[PDB]
Design an enzyme around this catalytic site. Sequence first.
Site, PDB file in Angstrom:
ATOM      1  N   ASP A 179       0.845  -1.194   0.000  1.00 16.50           N
ATOM      2  CA  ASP A 179       0.000   0.000   0.000  1.00 16.50           C
ATOM      3  C   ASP A 179       0.883   1.247   0.000  1.00 16.50           C
ATOM      4  O   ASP A 179       1.343   1.683   1.060  1.00 16.50           O
ATOM      5  CB  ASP A 179      -0.908  -0.002   1.230  1.00 16.50           C
ATOM      6  CG  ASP A 179      -1.814   1.204   1.294  1.00 16.50           C
ATOM      7  OD1 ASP A 179      -1.911   1.924   0.266  1.00 16.50           O
ATOM      8  OD2 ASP A 179      -2.455   1.416   2.361  1.00 16.50           O
TER       9      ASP A 179
ATOM     10  N   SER B  33      -0.374  15.586 -12.133  1.00 16.53           N
ATOM     11  CA  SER B  33      -0.585  15.220 -13.521  1.00 16.53           C
ATOM     12  C   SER B  33      -0.820  16.473 -14.347  1.00 16.53           C
ATOM     13  O   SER B  33      -1.361  17.468 -13.865  1.00 16.53           O
ATOM     14  CB  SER B  33      -1.791  14.278 -13.617  1.00 16.53           C
ATOM     15  OG  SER B  33      -2.170  14.015 -14.949  1.00 16.53           O
TER      16      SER B  33
HETATM   17  N1  LIG Z   1     -14.538  -6.310   2.393  1.00 13.82           N
HETATM   18  C1  LIG Z   1     -14.136  -5.618   1.202  1.00 13.82           C
HETATM   19  C2  LIG Z   1     -13.197  -4.440   1.403  1.00 13.82           C
HETATM   20  N2  LIG Z   1     -13.639  -3.121   1.468  1.00 13.82           N
HETATM   21  C3  LIG Z   1     -12.519  -2.312   1.664  1.00 13.82           C
HETATM   22  C4  LIG Z   1     -11.415  -3.160   1.753  1.00 13.82           C
HETATM   23  C5  LIG Z   1     -10.033  -2.761   1.863  1.00 13.82           C
HETATM   24  C6  LIG Z   1      -9.017  -3.595   1.384  1.00 13.82           C
HETATM   25  C7  LIG Z   1      -7.684  -3.223   1.402  1.00 13.82           C
HETATM   26  C8  LIG Z   1      -7.359  -1.975   1.896  1.00 13.82           C
HETATM   27  F1  LIG Z   1      -6.073  -1.612   1.909  1.00 13.82           F
HETATM   28  C9  LIG Z   1      -8.316  -1.093   2.367  1.00 13.82           C
HETATM   29  C10 LIG Z   1      -9.642  -1.498   2.324  1.00 13.82           C
HETATM   30  N3  LIG Z   1     -11.845  -4.470   1.561  1.00 13.82           N
END
Ligand SMILES: NCc1ncc(-c2ccc(F)cc2)[nH]1
EC number: 3.4.23.22
Length: 330
Positions: free
Chosen positions: A35, A199
């Site tokens: 991330d 951008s």
């Molecule tokens: N249950 C589904 C879902 N909704 C948001 C997420 C999520 C996944 C990864 C992240 F880094 C942040 C939010 N997953």
Amino acid sequence: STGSATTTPIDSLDDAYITPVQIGTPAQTLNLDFDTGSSDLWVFSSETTASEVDGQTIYTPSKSTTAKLLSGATWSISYGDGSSSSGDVYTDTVSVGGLTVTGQAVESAKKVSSSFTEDSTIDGLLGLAFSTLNTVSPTQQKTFFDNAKASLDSPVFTADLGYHAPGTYNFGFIDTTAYTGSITYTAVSTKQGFWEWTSTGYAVGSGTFKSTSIDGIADTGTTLLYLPATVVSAYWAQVSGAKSSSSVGGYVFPCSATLPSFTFGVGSARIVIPGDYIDFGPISTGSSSCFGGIQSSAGIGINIFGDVALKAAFVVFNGATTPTLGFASK
Ligand SMILES: NCc1ncc(-c2ccc(F)cc2)[nH]1
Ligand SMILES: NCc1ncc(-c2ccc(F)cc2)[nH]1
């Protein structure tokens, strides 16, 4: 040193990507969501509230001979979508694709929000934004990349996300076989802790390019492309029957449509997102209304170049003393 690891979409829509990460001694392999929009490495663990674990692989620090409690340290994070997690902290050995960091802060979740419990394929997050965003208290901790940086052949990592296919995260080198043409570099502001850049504009389909500055963040942890309402309206106006639905929570379009491409500017260069990358499928199983991959940022406070945009490019996160971003076609 270098590292290289394959990253794999978690589902048929590319909602997120997971990369295997070795933690502890002997290794415990967890599949983490890398991330570039956050700065905590946190995992499902033997400490996670049992009712909040549903299929994830857990880190058990008591089984790692190199794990050490970071005494007194806690963490708590809330993401832009409203998801959250919190817990305590260990240091341990962490390896990605052959690149090893000793003494990495591994944030062990005691609590996670329902969105994470429901993602059985995501065992935690590995943050790759700037360490100034790390939430550990009272002593802020460094990201995996910051800890690795001095050892790397070059102080860089690259994201090469696939469309409905695996891709690659590399650390410490730029694979010149992984992209076409040249890489265009652009300035980064670290003032908000993100890989924030500007951008130079956009085009919709075969239309003319509009030169306009769009400040936003390169965020591998966000699924979609979030841009100003003016830009997003101009895009969806080219799709017959597309509309913004308050009840659904964004732009939807007829599943029978063929979507136009979307181009964004990086300096004088251009990255083209094919139309198919913007299709996120039926809003509910069996529906003929499909969810759009370009959405308004108006309610967010920042524009987000998420996976929809980044997967159309080979992206260099250059962590030199003055950081920059690079984009190439591929
Ligand atoms: N249950 C589904 C879902 N909704 C948001 C997420 C999520 C996944 C990864 C992240 F880094 C942040 C939010 N997953
Ligand atoms: N737009 C609603 C929605 N449907 C599926 C998701 C999702 C998001 C992230 C993730 F990791 C897994 C699933 N979000």
